[PDB]
Short mmCIF file of C-alpha atoms and ligand atoms in Angstrom, two decimals:
data_model
loop_
_atom_site.label_atom_id
_atom_site.label_comp_id
_atom_site.label_asym_id
_atom_site.label_seq_id
_atom_site.Cartn_x
_atom_site.Cartn_y
_atom_site.Cartn_z
CA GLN A 1 0.00 0.00 0.00
CA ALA A 2 1.81 3.06 1.29
CA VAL A 3 5.44 3.86 0.79
CA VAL A 4 6.94 5.66 3.75
CA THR A 5 9.75 7.98 2.95
CA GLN A 6 12.54 9.22 5.21
CA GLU A 7 15.65 11.27 4.49
CA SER A 8 18.47 8.88 3.77
CA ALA A 9 21.20 10.60 5.79
CA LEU A 10 21.54 13.82 7.88
CA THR A 11 24.68 15.31 9.64
CA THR A 12 24.73 17.65 12.65
CA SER A 13 27.23 18.58 15.43
CA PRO A 14 26.89 18.03 19.26
CA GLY A 15 24.53 20.52 20.85
CA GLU A 16 22.64 21.32 17.62
CA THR A 17 19.02 20.56 16.80
CA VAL A 18 18.09 18.19 13.90
CA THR A 19 14.60 17.10 12.66
CA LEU A 20 13.90 13.89 10.75
CA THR A 21 10.60 13.50 8.76
CA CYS A 22 8.47 10.56 7.76
CA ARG A 23 5.78 10.87 5.14
CA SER A 24 3.32 8.58 3.38
CA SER A 25 2.27 8.05 -0.23
CA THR A 26 -1.38 8.14 0.93
CA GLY A 27 -1.11 11.81 1.75
CA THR A 28 -0.98 13.10 5.31
CA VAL A 29 0.17 11.21 8.35
CA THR A 30 -2.57 11.42 11.01
CA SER A 31 -2.72 10.64 14.71
CA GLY A 32 -4.48 7.37 13.77
CA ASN A 33 -1.24 6.31 11.96
CA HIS A 34 0.46 6.18 15.40
CA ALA A 35 3.96 7.16 14.10
CA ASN A 36 6.74 5.25 15.83
CA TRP A 37 10.44 6.03 15.81
CA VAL A 38 13.19 3.46 16.73
CA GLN A 39 16.97 3.60 16.79
CA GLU A 40 19.43 1.02 15.53
CA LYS A 41 22.98 1.17 16.88
CA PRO A 42 25.77 -1.30 15.81
CA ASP A 43 25.29 -4.99 16.32
CA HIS A 44 21.57 -5.05 16.01
CA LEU A 45 20.84 -3.04 19.09
CA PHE A 46 17.42 -1.50 18.75
CA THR A 47 15.76 0.89 21.09
CA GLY A 48 12.16 2.08 20.89
CA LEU A 49 12.23 5.88 20.96
CA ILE A 50 8.77 7.37 20.27
CA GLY A 51 5.38 5.62 20.15
CA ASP A 52 1.91 6.89 19.23
CA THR A 53 3.19 10.00 17.41
CA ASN A 54 4.70 11.65 20.54
CA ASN A 55 5.16 9.39 23.60
CA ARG A 56 8.80 8.78 24.59
CA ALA A 57 9.43 5.11 25.35
CA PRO A 58 10.67 4.23 28.92
CA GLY A 59 14.09 5.65 29.71
CA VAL A 60 14.49 7.69 26.50
CA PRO A 61 16.16 11.13 26.97
CA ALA A 62 13.99 14.24 26.96
CA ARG A 63 15.98 15.70 24.03
CA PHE A 64 14.04 13.33 21.71
CA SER A 65 10.49 14.45 20.85
CA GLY A 66 8.00 13.33 18.20
CA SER A 67 5.36 15.60 16.56
CA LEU A 68 3.29 15.79 13.36
CA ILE A 69 4.63 18.83 11.41
CA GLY A 70 1.90 19.46 9.00
CA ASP A 71 1.49 16.59 6.67
CA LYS A 72 4.48 14.65 8.11
CA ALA A 73 5.55 12.85 11.24
CA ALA A 74 8.81 14.26 12.67
CA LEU A 75 11.45 13.40 15.24
CA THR A 76 13.38 16.38 16.66
CA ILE A 77 16.57 15.89 18.67
CA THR A 78 17.18 19.09 20.65
CA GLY A 79 20.84 19.22 21.49
CA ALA A 80 22.15 16.14 19.71
CA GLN A 81 24.80 14.05 21.51
CA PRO A 82 27.68 12.01 19.90
CA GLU A 83 25.97 8.81 21.03
CA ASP A 84 22.92 9.64 18.86
CA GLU A 85 24.85 8.67 15.73
CA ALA A 86 22.68 5.74 14.60
CA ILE A 87 20.00 4.81 12.08
CA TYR A 88 16.43 5.93 12.82
CA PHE A 89 13.41 4.16 11.35
CA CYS A 90 9.89 5.44 11.46
CA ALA A 91 6.89 3.18 10.89
CA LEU A 92 3.22 4.02 10.32
CA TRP A 93 0.18 1.85 11.23
CA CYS A 94 -1.71 1.92 7.92
CA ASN A 95 -4.40 -0.63 6.89
CA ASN A 96 -3.58 -2.88 9.81
CA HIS A 97 0.11 -3.17 8.80
CA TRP A 98 3.13 -1.38 10.27
CA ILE A 99 4.95 0.04 7.24
CA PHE A 100 8.58 1.07 7.61
CA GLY A 101 10.51 3.94 6.19
CA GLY A 102 13.94 3.21 4.79
CA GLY A 103 15.86 4.61 7.78
CA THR A 104 17.80 7.87 8.10
CA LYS A 105 21.55 7.47 8.91
CA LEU A 106 22.27 10.36 11.34
CA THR A 107 25.89 11.47 11.77
CA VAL A 108 26.48 13.62 14.92
CA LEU A 109 30.11 14.78 14.32
CA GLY A 110 31.88 13.55 17.42
CA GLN A 111 35.39 13.84 15.92
CA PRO A 112 36.83 15.62 12.80
CA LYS A 113 35.92 14.24 9.42
CA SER A 114 38.44 11.69 8.07
CA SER A 115 39.08 10.68 4.44
CA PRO A 116 39.49 6.98 3.54
CA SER A 117 42.65 4.98 3.38
CA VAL A 118 42.12 2.85 0.30
CA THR A 119 44.41 -0.11 -0.42
CA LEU A 120 44.01 -2.24 -3.55
CA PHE A 121 45.63 -5.65 -3.55
CA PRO A 122 46.13 -7.80 -6.72
CA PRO A 123 45.13 -11.56 -6.87
CA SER A 124 47.65 -13.85 -5.14
CA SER A 125 49.54 -16.38 -7.42
CA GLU A 126 48.08 -19.28 -5.43
CA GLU A 127 44.54 -18.12 -6.16
CA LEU A 128 45.47 -17.49 -9.88
CA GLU A 129 46.37 -21.18 -9.88
CA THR A 130 42.73 -22.07 -9.13
CA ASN A 131 41.68 -20.10 -12.24
CA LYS A 132 40.04 -17.34 -10.22
CA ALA A 133 41.20 -13.81 -9.51
CA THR A 134 39.81 -11.59 -6.73
CA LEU A 135 40.99 -7.99 -6.36
CA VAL A 136 40.44 -6.68 -2.86
CA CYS A 137 39.91 -3.00 -2.06
CA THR A 138 40.03 -2.12 1.70
CA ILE A 139 38.70 1.27 2.79
CA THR A 140 39.33 2.27 6.39
CA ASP A 141 39.33 5.21 8.70
CA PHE A 142 36.66 7.34 7.11
CA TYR A 143 34.23 9.56 8.92
CA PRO A 144 31.26 10.31 8.16
CA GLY A 145 30.65 6.58 7.56
CA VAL A 146 29.10 6.98 4.11
CA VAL A 147 31.11 6.05 1.03
CA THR A 148 30.40 4.97 -2.60
CA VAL A 149 32.72 2.47 -4.36
CA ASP A 150 33.21 2.21 -8.11
CA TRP A 151 35.41 -0.24 -10.07
CA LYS A 152 36.84 0.34 -13.57
CA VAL A 153 38.62 -2.15 -15.77
CA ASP A 154 40.64 -0.43 -18.55
CA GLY A 155 38.47 2.58 -17.99
CA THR A 156 35.07 0.88 -18.51
CA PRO A 157 32.61 0.96 -15.54
CA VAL A 158 32.21 -2.45 -13.97
CA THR A 159 28.76 -3.29 -12.65
CA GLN A 160 29.01 -7.09 -12.66
CA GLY A 161 31.10 -9.24 -10.33
CA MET A 162 31.66 -6.90 -7.39
CA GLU A 163 30.47 -7.09 -3.80
CA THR A 164 30.98 -4.22 -1.29
CA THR A 165 30.26 -4.49 2.43
CA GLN A 166 28.22 -2.01 4.48
CA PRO A 167 30.39 0.45 6.51
CA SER A 168 31.36 -1.04 9.92
CA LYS A 169 32.25 1.24 12.90
CA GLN A 170 35.90 0.71 13.87
CA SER A 171 36.87 0.76 17.56
CA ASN A 172 38.13 4.31 17.09
CA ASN A 173 34.62 5.15 15.73
CA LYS A 174 35.65 5.88 12.20
CA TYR A 175 34.31 3.35 9.63
CA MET A 176 35.68 0.66 7.30
CA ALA A 177 34.32 -1.28 4.26
CA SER A 178 35.84 -3.66 1.63
CA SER A 179 34.93 -4.40 -1.99
CA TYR A 180 35.78 -7.46 -4.08
CA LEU A 181 36.04 -7.73 -7.87
CA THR A 182 36.11 -11.45 -8.73
CA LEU A 183 37.16 -12.58 -12.24
CA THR A 184 38.35 -15.76 -13.93
CA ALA A 185 42.12 -15.94 -14.45
CA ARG A 186 41.38 -15.72 -18.18
CA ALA A 187 39.42 -12.46 -17.95
CA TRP A 188 42.13 -11.03 -15.66
CA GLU A 189 44.66 -11.75 -18.33
CA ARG A 190 42.62 -9.80 -20.91
CA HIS A 191 42.95 -6.38 -19.16
CA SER A 192 45.75 -4.09 -17.98
CA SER A 193 44.46 -1.41 -15.61
CA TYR A 194 42.15 -2.02 -12.67
CA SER A 195 40.87 0.77 -10.43
CA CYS A 196 38.90 0.99 -7.23
CA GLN A 197 37.43 4.49 -6.81
CA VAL A 198 36.02 5.59 -3.51
CA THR A 199 34.01 8.78 -3.14
CA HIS A 200 33.54 10.26 0.30
CA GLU A 201 32.15 13.77 0.94
CA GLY A 202 32.28 14.79 -2.74
CA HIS A 203 35.93 13.75 -3.21
CA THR A 204 37.13 10.57 -4.94
CA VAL A 205 40.20 8.65 -3.89
CA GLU A 206 41.35 6.19 -6.61
CA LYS A 207 43.79 3.29 -6.45
CA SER A 208 44.82 1.55 -9.71
CA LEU A 209 47.05 -1.34 -10.70
CA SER A 210 48.30 -2.77 -13.92
CA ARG A 211 48.42 -6.53 -14.57
CA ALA A 212 52.25 -6.55 -14.81
CA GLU B 1 13.79 -4.94 34.27
CA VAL B 2 11.85 -5.84 31.01
CA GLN B 3 13.69 -8.47 28.93
CA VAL B 4 12.81 -10.13 25.67
CA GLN B 5 14.95 -13.23 25.35
CA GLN B 6 15.30 -14.78 21.86
CA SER B 7 16.33 -18.16 20.64
CA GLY B 8 19.72 -18.41 18.93
CA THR B 9 21.10 -18.86 15.45
CA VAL B 10 19.46 -21.29 12.98
CA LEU B 11 20.71 -22.84 9.83
CA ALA B 12 18.03 -24.47 7.68
CA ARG B 13 17.83 -25.98 4.18
CA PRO B 14 15.34 -24.88 1.43
CA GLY B 15 11.88 -26.38 1.90
CA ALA B 16 12.22 -26.79 5.69
CA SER B 17 10.30 -25.13 8.51
CA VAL B 18 11.71 -23.65 11.82
CA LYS B 19 10.26 -22.48 15.10
CA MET B 20 11.65 -19.38 16.83
CA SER B 21 10.73 -18.25 20.36
CA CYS B 22 10.73 -15.15 22.52
CA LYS B 23 10.46 -15.30 26.26
CA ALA B 24 9.33 -12.28 28.24
CA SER B 25 10.69 -10.97 31.59
CA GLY B 26 9.76 -7.96 33.77
CA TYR B 27 6.06 -7.42 32.88
CA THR B 28 2.58 -8.90 32.49
CA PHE B 29 2.83 -10.93 29.27
CA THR B 30 -0.92 -10.95 28.80
CA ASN B 31 -1.33 -7.16 28.69
CA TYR B 32 1.04 -6.55 25.76
CA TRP B 33 1.50 -7.49 22.11
CA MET B 34 4.43 -9.41 20.81
CA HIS B 35 5.40 -8.29 17.28
CA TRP B 36 7.93 -10.03 14.98
CA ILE B 37 10.22 -7.97 12.65
CA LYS B 38 12.37 -9.20 9.75
CA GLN B 39 15.64 -7.41 8.91
CA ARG B 40 17.08 -8.51 5.57
CA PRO B 41 20.78 -7.41 5.02
CA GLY B 42 19.85 -4.39 2.97
CA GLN B 43 16.18 -4.61 2.44
CA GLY B 44 15.15 -2.69 5.54
CA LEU B 45 12.73 -3.86 8.15
CA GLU B 46 9.45 -5.64 7.46
CA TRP B 47 6.69 -6.29 9.94
CA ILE B 48 5.57 -9.97 9.96
CA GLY B 49 2.72 -9.80 12.45
CA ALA B 50 1.75 -9.54 16.10
CA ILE B 51 -0.05 -11.62 18.74
CA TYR B 52 -1.99 -10.53 21.83
CA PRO B 53 -1.32 -13.46 24.28
CA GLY B 54 -4.23 -12.48 26.56
CA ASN B 55 -6.67 -13.88 23.97
CA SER B 56 -4.44 -14.89 21.08
CA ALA B 57 -5.74 -12.23 18.66
CA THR B 58 -3.19 -11.82 15.82
CA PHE B 59 -2.56 -9.34 12.97
CA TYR B 60 -0.50 -10.55 9.98
CA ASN B 61 1.16 -8.78 7.18
CA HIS B 62 -0.64 -10.12 4.02
CA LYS B 63 2.73 -10.98 2.52
CA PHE B 64 3.60 -13.30 5.38
CA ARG B 65 0.20 -15.00 5.97
CA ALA B 66 1.33 -18.04 3.95
CA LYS B 67 4.76 -18.14 5.60
CA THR B 68 4.24 -17.54 9.29
CA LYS B 69 2.31 -18.92 12.12
CA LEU B 70 2.30 -17.02 15.40
CA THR B 71 1.47 -18.58 18.79
CA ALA B 72 2.11 -17.82 22.47
CA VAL B 73 2.01 -19.99 25.58
CA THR B 74 0.75 -17.90 28.45
CA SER B 75 2.09 -20.28 31.19
CA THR B 76 5.54 -20.31 29.72
CA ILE B 77 5.45 -16.59 28.76
CA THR B 78 6.79 -17.50 25.37
CA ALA B 79 5.70 -16.42 21.88
CA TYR B 80 6.68 -18.60 18.91
CA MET B 81 6.85 -17.97 15.25
CA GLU B 82 6.95 -20.83 12.79
CA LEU B 83 8.15 -20.17 9.24
CA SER B 84 7.38 -22.84 6.66
CA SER B 85 8.77 -23.54 3.13
CA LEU B 86 11.99 -21.74 3.63
CA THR B 87 13.64 -20.16 0.61
CA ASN B 88 16.87 -18.21 0.43
CA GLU B 89 14.79 -15.03 0.76
CA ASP B 90 13.86 -15.95 4.32
CA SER B 91 17.51 -15.60 5.40
CA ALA B 92 17.37 -12.59 7.76
CA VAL B 93 17.68 -11.55 11.39
CA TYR B 94 14.28 -11.75 13.14
CA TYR B 95 13.38 -9.68 16.21
CA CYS B 96 10.43 -9.99 18.57
CA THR B 97 9.35 -6.66 20.08
CA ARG B 98 6.88 -5.68 22.83
CA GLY B 99 3.99 -3.53 21.71
CA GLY B 100 1.06 -1.79 23.27
CA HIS B 101 -1.46 0.82 22.29
CA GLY B 102 -0.09 2.86 19.44
CA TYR B 103 3.31 1.17 19.26
CA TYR B 104 4.97 -2.08 18.22
CA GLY B 105 8.37 -2.12 19.94
CA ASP B 106 9.51 -0.19 22.97
CA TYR B 107 11.69 -3.16 24.10
CA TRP B 108 13.42 -5.29 21.47
CA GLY B 109 14.84 -8.77 21.56
CA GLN B 110 18.40 -9.26 20.38
CA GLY B 111 17.62 -10.88 17.06
CA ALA B 112 17.89 -14.48 15.88
CA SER B 113 19.81 -15.02 12.67
CA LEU B 114 18.40 -17.50 10.18
CA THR B 115 20.40 -18.62 7.19
CA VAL B 116 18.63 -20.83 4.59
CA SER B 117 21.18 -22.50 2.44
CA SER B 118 21.71 -25.57 0.34
CA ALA B 119 25.47 -25.49 1.02
CA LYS B 120 27.62 -28.05 2.75
CA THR B 121 30.17 -27.16 5.43
CA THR B 122 33.22 -25.94 3.45
CA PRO B 123 36.64 -24.85 4.83
CA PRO B 124 38.21 -21.55 3.66
CA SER B 125 40.93 -21.17 1.10
CA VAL B 126 43.25 -18.53 2.68
CA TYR B 127 45.28 -16.38 0.33
CA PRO B 128 48.03 -13.93 1.46
CA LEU B 129 47.70 -10.30 0.26
CA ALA B 130 51.10 -8.65 -0.05
CA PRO B 131 51.59 -5.27 -1.86
CA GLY B 132 54.94 -6.43 -3.02
CA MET B 140 53.65 1.98 6.62
CA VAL B 141 52.51 -1.11 4.69
CA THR B 142 49.18 -2.96 4.70
CA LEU B 143 49.11 -6.70 4.46
CA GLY B 144 45.95 -8.80 4.31
CA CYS B 145 44.51 -12.27 4.10
CA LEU B 146 41.56 -13.27 2.00
CA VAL B 147 39.39 -16.03 3.52
CA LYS B 148 37.51 -17.31 0.52
CA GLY B 149 34.73 -19.84 0.16
CA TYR B 150 33.70 -21.09 3.61
CA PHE B 151 30.35 -22.25 5.01
CA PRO B 152 28.90 -21.74 7.62
CA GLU B 153 29.82 -18.56 9.50
CA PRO B 154 32.05 -17.75 11.45
CA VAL B 155 35.80 -17.77 10.95
CA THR B 156 38.18 -15.97 13.39
CA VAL B 157 41.32 -14.20 12.17
CA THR B 158 44.24 -13.31 14.38
CA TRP B 159 47.62 -11.98 13.30
CA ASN B 160 50.75 -13.55 14.71
CA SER B 161 48.68 -15.55 17.13
CA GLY B 162 47.25 -12.42 18.71
CA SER B 163 50.42 -10.32 19.18
CA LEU B 164 49.48 -8.03 16.35
CA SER B 165 46.35 -6.48 17.72
CA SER B 166 46.73 -2.82 16.76
CA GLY B 167 45.91 -1.78 13.21
CA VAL B 168 43.91 -4.95 12.40
CA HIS B 169 40.63 -4.63 10.42
CA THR B 170 38.58 -7.74 9.75
CA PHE B 171 35.68 -7.00 7.45
CA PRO B 172 32.16 -8.46 7.39
CA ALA B 173 31.70 -11.52 5.21
CA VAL B 174 30.02 -11.16 1.83
CA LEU B 175 28.24 -14.07 0.18
CA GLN B 176 29.75 -15.01 -3.18
CA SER B 177 27.64 -17.84 -4.57
CA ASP B 178 26.53 -19.71 -1.45
CA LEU B 179 29.87 -19.40 0.27
CA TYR B 180 31.25 -16.55 2.36
CA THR B 181 34.35 -14.47 1.75
CA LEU B 182 35.87 -12.07 4.29
CA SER B 183 39.30 -10.46 4.56
CA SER B 184 41.46 -8.92 7.32
CA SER B 185 44.22 -6.37 7.03
CA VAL B 186 47.03 -5.27 9.36
CA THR B 187 49.06 -2.10 8.81
CA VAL B 188 52.62 -2.16 10.22
CA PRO B 189 55.66 0.24 9.96
CA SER B 190 57.54 -0.28 6.72
CA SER B 191 60.80 -1.11 8.59
CA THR B 192 59.09 -3.97 10.35
CA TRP B 193 58.31 -6.06 7.24
CA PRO B 194 59.80 -8.31 5.89
CA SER B 195 62.16 -8.35 8.93
CA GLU B 196 59.44 -9.34 11.35
CA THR B 197 57.30 -12.11 9.95
CA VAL B 198 53.59 -11.36 9.76
CA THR B 199 51.25 -14.43 9.64
CA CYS B 200 47.41 -14.47 9.66
CA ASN B 201 45.81 -17.35 11.59
CA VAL B 202 42.37 -18.44 10.36
CA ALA B 203 40.20 -20.84 12.33
CA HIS B 204 36.92 -22.17 10.99
CA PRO B 205 35.39 -24.20 13.90
CA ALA B 206 32.51 -25.85 11.92
CA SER B 207 35.07 -27.68 9.78
CA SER B 208 37.79 -27.65 12.53
CA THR B 209 40.18 -25.87 10.23
CA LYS B 210 43.14 -23.83 11.55
CA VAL B 211 45.53 -22.48 8.90
CA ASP B 212 48.39 -20.03 9.20
CA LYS B 213 49.53 -18.06 6.16
CA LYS B 214 52.83 -16.10 6.27
CA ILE B 215 52.77 -12.92 4.14
CA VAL B 216 55.75 -13.06 1.79
CA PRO B 217 56.93 -10.00 -0.29
CA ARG B 218 55.98 -10.36 -3.91
C1 LIG C 1 -7.92 -6.67 18.44
C2 LIG C 1 -7.53 -6.73 19.93
O1 LIG C 1 -8.51 -7.53 20.63
C3 LIG C 1 -8.21 -7.86 22.02
O2 LIG C 1 -7.07 -8.67 22.08
C4 LIG C 1 -7.92 -6.61 22.87
O3 LIG C 1 -9.10 -5.90 23.14
C5 LIG C 1 -6.92 -5.70 22.15
O4 LIG C 1 -6.75 -4.48 22.83
C6 LIG C 1 -7.41 -5.38 20.71
O5 LIG C 1 -6.48 -4.49 20.09
C7 LIG C 1 -6.96 -3.39 19.30
O6 LIG C 1 -7.50 -2.35 20.13
C8 LIG C 1 -6.62 -1.57 20.97
C9 LIG C 1 -7.42 -0.32 21.45
O7 LIG C 1 -7.86 -0.50 22.79
C10 LIG C 1 -5.37 -1.12 20.17
O8 LIG C 1 -4.41 -0.65 21.09
C11 LIG C 1 -4.77 -2.24 19.36
O9 LIG C 1 -3.77 -1.69 18.51
C12 LIG C 1 -2.41 -1.87 18.92
O10 LIG C 1 -1.97 -3.13 18.47
C13 LIG C 1 -1.94 -3.30 17.04
C14 LIG C 1 -1.45 -4.72 16.75
C15 LIG C 1 -1.02 -2.20 16.38
O11 LIG C 1 0.34 -2.39 16.74
C16 LIG C 1 -1.51 -0.81 16.79
C17 LIG C 1 -1.60 -0.70 18.32
O12 LIG C 1 -2.26 0.52 18.63
C18 LIG C 1 -5.80 -2.88 18.46
O13 LIG C 1 -6.24 -1.92 17.48
C19 LIG C 1 -6.54 -2.38 16.16
O14 LIG C 1 -7.81 -3.02 16.20
C20 LIG C 1 -8.93 -2.20 16.59
C21 LIG C 1 -10.16 -3.14 16.72
O15 LIG C 1 -11.21 -2.50 17.41
C22 LIG C 1 -9.04 -1.00 15.61
O16 LIG C 1 -9.29 -1.42 14.27
C23 LIG C 1 -7.70 -0.24 15.66
O17 LIG C 1 -7.73 0.87 14.76
C24 LIG C 1 -7.44 2.18 15.26
O18 LIG C 1 -8.64 2.94 15.13
C25 LIG C 1 -9.05 3.20 13.79
C26 LIG C 1 -10.42 3.90 13.81
C27 LIG C 1 -7.91 3.97 13.11
O19 LIG C 1 -8.30 4.35 11.78
C28 LIG C 1 -8.38 5.75 11.45
O20 LIG C 1 -7.13 6.30 10.98
C29 LIG C 1 -6.65 5.86 9.69
C30 LIG C 1 -5.42 6.73 9.40
O21 LIG C 1 -5.76 8.11 9.35
C31 LIG C 1 -7.75 6.01 8.59
O22 LIG C 1 -7.35 5.40 7.37
C32 LIG C 1 -9.05 5.34 9.06
O23 LIG C 1 -10.05 5.60 8.10
C33 LIG C 1 -9.47 5.89 10.42
O24 LIG C 1 -9.66 7.28 10.29
C34 LIG C 1 -10.56 7.98 11.14
O25 LIG C 1 -10.08 9.32 11.26
C35 LIG C 1 -9.77 9.96 9.98
C36 LIG C 1 -9.10 11.30 10.31
O26 LIG C 1 -7.96 11.01 11.12
C37 LIG C 1 -11.04 9.97 9.08
O27 LIG C 1 -12.05 10.80 9.61
C38 LIG C 1 -11.67 8.56 9.00
O28 LIG C 1 -12.93 8.64 8.35
C39 LIG C 1 -11.90 7.97 10.44
O29 LIG C 1 -12.43 6.65 10.42
C40 LIG C 1 -6.66 3.11 13.04
O30 LIG C 1 -5.63 3.78 12.37
C41 LIG C 1 -6.27 2.77 14.46
O31 LIG C 1 -5.84 3.96 15.06
C42 LIG C 1 -6.56 -1.17 15.23
O32 LIG C 1 -5.33 -0.48 15.31
#
């Protein structure tokens, strides 16, 4: 039925106020849609935040409030704290189903931004023996934890045969991710330049190698 | 305080059925709803349905009415969810949550992972990743099931280690781990990654050699 739409990512600093919205393809969100907000922190730790449009769940800080702002449901964090960096999902009770938004990733800048360290490794000889070739791109130490990864083989965009992981928080609270380009040894042998291109905060970092 | 205790990890084959459970602590089970939520790797959250244990009223998502059967045992303060005819698409983490009037989940369980696979237990192939500070890595390719552990030099190299989440390539997992060390240190000081895969009792050490 409805599609519930949330911002995909927002950034703020400690002590600032940020508002997240949740809207429906049926038109306005009403009180009868009982908007709920929940928080997901790393390792599948979920906390109920807001229920029934505006009730804080037990033990939730006062800085979190829910309201309907016009046609939309909203979550306002007054005086955001570094620990509020998390993903926030709203859900709407519509037609006897709870329908979820896609989640907003909120960054609350707890430390300076950090650009990625990108390392590209070629296939090992022992794997080339099995007739397979995986190139590994590791991307660490970036903050905000949002990155896009692109592969090119002799300049042509690759959009077949690559897997990238979701950004994981490192213990120092920056983020890491890896991407794999897997090819047959034969196909590896047909191309010279391989590049892993990582864009973070409007700037691309690129690492390239040549088969030779 | 309130606690929602979930059953553990499940591995099932296509066509099977599994029963998951959630046990309540810290409140009157019969006055609250138990909801079940599916989180698929990057498919967001989906609501499966909810049961009111006081009188076993249920609400189901239409999409899951053929897949799920919800029950609760009021003496045992346990809700169950049975999933039949498992396909690969049912692989997900499932949560049970406590709901009430106007909400579905103020307290959440910890999640139960379900993997539906046709694969057999397979040990990793471990490949060293040399360039030629320096970053070295190991690729742990083609293992089933999860997990594998990776240490570097039997645990002595603990700083500057990154082990990434596994991706699924075909029906086998691949993960890698990297360690960054001062350039003076290697190759003088040997660096070795140690990979253990308990399900196939595999333990393999791979020394990183300059290329
Ligand atoms: C079924 C169960 O039976 C026993 O076990 C026990 O008595 C339980 O308590 C009982 O549970 C129902 O009743 C509880 C109320 O005491 C309620 O807390 C339960 O809901 C909770 O649990 C479920 C699983 C969800 O997680 C939501 C939780 O809140 C549960 O409620 C559900 O079942 C009852 C059955 O009587 C109702 O159907 C209830 O619906 C609510 O009321 C209706 C009227 C709301 O619909 C309005 O809003 C919609 C969105 O705007 C709109 O599309 C509808 O048309 C309707 O709109 C009305 O206002 C509009 C302007 O806002 C228009 O004017 C329109 O013309 C009006 O009709 C619905 O959204 C719910 O809020 C249902 O949730």
